[PDB]
Amino acid sequence: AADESERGMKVIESRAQKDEEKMEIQEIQLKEAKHIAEDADRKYEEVARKLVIIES
Amino acid sequence: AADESERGMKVIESRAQKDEEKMEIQEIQLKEAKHIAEDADRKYEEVARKLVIIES
Amino acid sequence: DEDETTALVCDNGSGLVKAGFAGDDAPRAVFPSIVGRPRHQGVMVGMGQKDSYVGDEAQSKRGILTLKYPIEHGIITNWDDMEKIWHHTFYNELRVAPEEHPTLLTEAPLNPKANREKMTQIMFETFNVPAMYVAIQAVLSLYASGRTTGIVLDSGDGVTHNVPIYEGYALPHAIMRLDLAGRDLTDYLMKILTERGYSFVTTAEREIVRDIKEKLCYVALDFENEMATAASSSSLEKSYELPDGQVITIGNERFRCPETLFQPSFIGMESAGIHETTYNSIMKCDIDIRKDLYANNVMSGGTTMYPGIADRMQKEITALAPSTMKIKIIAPPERKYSVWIGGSILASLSTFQQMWITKQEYDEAGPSIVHR
Amino acid sequence: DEDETTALVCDNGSGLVKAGFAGDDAPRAVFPSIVGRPRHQGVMVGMGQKDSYVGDEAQSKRGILTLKYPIEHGIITNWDDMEKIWHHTFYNELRVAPEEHPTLLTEAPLNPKANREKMTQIMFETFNVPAMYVAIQAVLSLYASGRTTGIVLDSGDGVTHNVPIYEGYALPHAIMRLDLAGRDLTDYLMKILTERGYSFVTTAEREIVRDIKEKLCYVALDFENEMATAASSSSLEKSYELPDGQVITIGNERFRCPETLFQPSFIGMESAGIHETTYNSIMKCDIDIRKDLYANNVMSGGTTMYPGIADRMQKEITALAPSTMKIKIIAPPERKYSVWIGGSILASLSTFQQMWITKQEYDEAGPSIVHR
């Protein structure tokens, strides 16, 4: 019973590492994607306000 | 040795589930964040082109 | 409606006042926190002799007046001149009569007990407001970001603060104050820009260095290999056109200015910087609450608006915090009004009615009543 | 079913309450035996003013409350605060109304006559339970291991005991109490771990030393040449990852902590240790019953769960007992709930119905009735 439970432990620990790495790479790609979404959505409100003032 | 390795198995399987869920919720939040970043990056390339013509 | 419409929210700052009605999404009134006193006798065409000037008329006419700032570093230092800014806010800016409006005011982090009692004395006894309430600024900022536990890095015009808050109670012994903010930051840009070979000679040159700081300044992550980048000279440069043609270029200094917030040594300050201070606040708090504070670094204040401030802070504290920890730097877009918006929410709220200090409480308990 | 379903079993401890329904295999409710009283006036968001807190809400909110333990060393010391823990158990934890449930309670080994009468007074007169019964703890532990004669080494959070039982009657004059248990043991680990060059500084560092003790601590047999082993430095070491990354390593101290149970001298205790005390209990009993007690050393309690406790005890008493004797140390896996399980069995039993003290017995005989 012990040897079968050690083997299963090893396999689920390896899957848990393999997925924990995937989360961290997405979680980081996203602080990036959200930050470029926000740097983009500021530049505009300055350019669109700049548009409405130079149209006026 | 068997009871400690069963307990550790249970705890790492529980962490593996808990993190697999976190990845899926970030991975989905991101198709959303990247898509809003792109719906954003088209309309101020349009509004800034509209700006440069009404500034000219 | 009696007071649903009627609650006022006045956030008193070192540089700006933010004011308006509880309910609104943003301040109806924003203006400098100055009180000008004319250096000479005379008049403007069509007006009478004016003893005093406040806000923008004091800024615009600064050449003939002696300008004074009532709030030094977030604390009210001159009460004669503050009652003047309040008067202006109610009567001219919001054009309301105060004696029928409940007024939510804000104070600073370790505001002396005696001050909270004094502005209550002036609110009730010289403005005769029905009821009032003083909220702590970081606490309204947090709450406006939905939560109740977190640590706010708050940074405006004269002060920076770190106020760790747990289930609403700001933690007195863990609060840190750093007297370097947006005011200090405009004057440093000034010098690195004259030092770029320029001259901000007339007052129309002075004022706009501040508009350069706001529009073009950045907080780079890896400020190290950003200077290095500056040198290879990429299309990193940025030219601004002055009141006239005089196109001034700012490439590099653009980020050397907010690197002052992480390195106070850029300005002859020996104090620690923003990120270390976030952290030190945190290793001054209870142990069990430190995972909470780390996942809830809420930013508020005009000077925390520099783009990429959050990414630099993100990486600044990850790399100081134990790896077992989750770091999370929340920086909302409306952050230059977080404080105010948190007050608008709170004061328009359904449950806040029972915390308003009324003239009944006051006339019966003395200023002590609101002091808590 | 009337009461087959309906019997409650509440085991009151120095650290934990274990509670649930007779019939179940394990306690439905397990929680700290604290009652917190707020040090300041104020509220949590959305709740009202609370006068008191019990169990985990008292632990979680410990920074604003004064925590108090009603049971000192297994004996109820504060009856106002105990009625509070019972109230919480029935109404919030098990969510039952007590006035229709028979309640089996437990008491400690030489529990003063007057207490057994007082908790009966409170069970029947303030909770209005239909019927109740007080079992002695070691006696339920034994019985849950099937037998009726044996000696229980019982060890939990504030007390250790040896209760020799013969055909069900616990032997008053042979019972030994040693006031050093799991609570004492967590605080000693604490010091040998700070002494390993560490700091359990915030409250999130304090609490988890106890989770280190539970997960990684051992009772080595031949604790002598285990220290010797430590030195050659084998892969005996064990690193635990803290709330954050901060991987702490514990090699050796891992077993220096339960060696405290055999050597009280590790902690400035002059009393004898667990194994000697097992033995002394035994040479205080009748002669003809000593072979029985020796082949039936039943262990129960959270602190007897340290792996290899049984092997060390096995060899500890073989080598003190006359060689003509059979030694036998029974340590079941569910032992942190033996006491409770013994109560669940007994109270769900077919023959126990005729020992329940009913309100009829009480209203007619006074607290004396159940006291026996």
Next chain:
Amino acid sequence: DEDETTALVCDNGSGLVKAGFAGDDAPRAVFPSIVGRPRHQGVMVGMGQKDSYVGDEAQSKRGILTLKYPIEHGIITNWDDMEKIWHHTFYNELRVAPEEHPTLLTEAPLNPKANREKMTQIMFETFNVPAMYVAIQAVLSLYASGRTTGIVLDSGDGVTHNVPIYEGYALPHAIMRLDLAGRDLTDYLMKILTERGYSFVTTAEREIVRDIKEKLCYVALDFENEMATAASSSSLEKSYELPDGQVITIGNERFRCPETLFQPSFIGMESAGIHETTYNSIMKCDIDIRKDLYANNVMSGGTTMYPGIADRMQKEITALAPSTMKIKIIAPPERKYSVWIGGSILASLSTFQQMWITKQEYDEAGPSIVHR
């Protein structure tokens, strides 16, 4: 004379080193326990490039160096920087060559075995002293007050301790350490004095708050009706003249600072205070020795010098101790050097010669020899 003259006594503290010759009545050398490392390359006029600075030259030149404290809370934390402070002590401060002087050193209450062996390794192997000896600090303080059994409340710059000693052996399991001392106390005064409406802005303002604490601070007995007294405003106030004219007044806060030692809650500390801790040490000791400890509360350390500390402690423990007991709080005048003086006495003593660890003992037994 060989060594009658020749024995050195070095007391290593968290804030100060006290040093001199066994025989003298007071330390020949007292100086900060810092090691400064220059932040920039350059020189003073007439000197060469200096890699390091120690004691007062590190304090005086602090603006261009990074200051570091080798002893954190009484324990040596950096051994590179400590060997630097020792070097300075022998060669510059006492101007002796160490290789012909026996050296009595002191260590802290539960100083890790390994440290006592390490400073022995450095004393004998890098300084080549003839012989040395490490005394425990509370133990030298007691002995300098004539006696051998008592309990010392020892309080300096980074730690407070209670060390119950019986016929010379300090009692390991009854010792209590409270990490709040004179350093913590100067920083709290700082805030209650800026909070009185002041500014300790330049470094010449910072340093002198500590000289205010030493000269004007008090420990009032009945700290309750001393605040009450403050309010009626008696001639309790006290103005100090700064480096310049700037006469600062301190009336009240004067005693609010040492009330921190009885109430750690003044500074966000949740630990118990000095008097309770004296007591708890005492109800952790053997029963038969508790009358002795109570009649012999010896005080030592810079922070126990606040006038009226002894009267407050006198009444603090009388009212916690059983009335059958005799309380007695000994606080001598030289107490800021008790530790040192106890070493001077002991090491100049006629009978101590046979406990000196000699290089013969060391070269033959390893660091283990002195470790005891």
